[PDB]
């Protein structure tokens, strides 16, 4: 219980596995996305992760495609996302494969509440507007 096993297959046991034999080990949504092909932008992004995986492209990977499905290629490195105004780092670990990329870059600031004002109740609605 220190190694990670997804469906009985270790990381480097599945790291060399294919992409059509892979999808039988993912839930519906990701199996279907892997079956209607990848979008053009995600092609352009995989063709920048693989270079950054061999020896080249030692430069921060950025993106707008929050839809990309994490895969056994991306385990280990640290890529960015775009949560609306800025690029936020997501250090990819195992136990993320299957989830969505944008799933880890939240998008609305947590809310903390002040105090009710003029109109929050029927006792301060017409007693203010004269």
């Amino acid at each position: 219980r220190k190694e990670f096993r997804y469906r009985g297959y270790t990381l480097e046991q599945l790291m060399n596995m294919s992409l059509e034999e892979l999808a039988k080990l993912l839930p519906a949504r990701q199996r279907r996305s892997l079956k209607r092909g990848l979008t053009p932008e995600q092609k352009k992004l995989l063709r920048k992760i693989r270079l950054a995986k061999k020896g080249k492209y030692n430069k921060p990977i950025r993106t707008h495609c929050r839809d990309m499905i994490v895969l056994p290629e991306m385990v280990g490195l640290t890529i960015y996302v775009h949560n609306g105004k800025e690029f936020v780092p997501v250090e990819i670990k195992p136990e993320m494969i299957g989830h969505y990329l944008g799933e880890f870059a939240p998008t609305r600031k947590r809310v903390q509440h002040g105090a009710p004002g003029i109109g929050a109740t029927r006792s301060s609605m017409f007693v203010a507007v004269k």
Binding site: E95, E103, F104, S123, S124
Partner: protein
């Protein structure tokens, strides 16, 4: 226990479906301007 560890697993990686489990809020995309009032009333003046 199995459900609990399936929740902790989402708490680790800091997903979006794990933080809602943290703060005790809806999880499956509901709206909350109007329902889910598990708190206590607030006053202004009288």
């Amino acid at each position: 226990m199995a459900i609990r560890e399936d929740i902790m697993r989402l708490r680790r990686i800091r997903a979006y479906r794990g933080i809602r489990h943290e703060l005790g809020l809806p999880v499956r995309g509901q709206r909350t301007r109007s329902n889910f009032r598990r708190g206590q009333t607030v006053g202004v003046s009288r």
